[PDB]
Amino acid sequence: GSVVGGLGGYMLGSAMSRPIIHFGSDYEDRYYRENMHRYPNQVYYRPCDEYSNQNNFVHDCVNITIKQHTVTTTTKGENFTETDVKMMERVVEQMCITQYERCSQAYYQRGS
Structure with a gap:
């Protein structure tokens, strides 16, 4: 059959729920609260073996x-x-940071 080449590489994470971001603006509150009803539930990243900073990682992750x-x-x-x-x-950034943290858990659990 066969169409598309892929985005590039990456993996798809397990889900977490929305980080419940407040912006300190009620306009931005009653926007976000209702908009989050369609928001991402997972994110795209690498294993811990492909650590290249957090900032650039998270921002390219956000893009994807x-x-x-x-x-x-x-x-x-x-x-x-x-x-x-x-x-x-x-x-998407919050969720990306959080999954890099939840990656570091494995590096804590490999070590007896």
């Missing part, structure tokens, strides 16, 4: 998972805004 849902909604005709992208970046 955002681009992914973006591409997966553009077909339907969806149109996000600046605030929408910036709002998900906050979450």
Whole structure:
């Protein structure tokens, strides 16, 4: 059959629930609270064997998972805004940091 080449590489994490980001703006509160009802549940990353910083990791990670849902909604005709992208970046980043932490757990558990 066979179409598409892949994005590049990466893995898909196990899920976690939304990190429940407050922005200290009630506009941004009653936006996020309702928008999170469609947000990412997982994220895309490497094993612990492919550690190359946290900052650049998390930001390229953000791109992938955002681009992914973006591409997966553009077909339907969806149109996000600046605030929408910036709002998900906050979450997808939070979730990415958290999964790099949950990677480091394995490095704690390999060691008796």
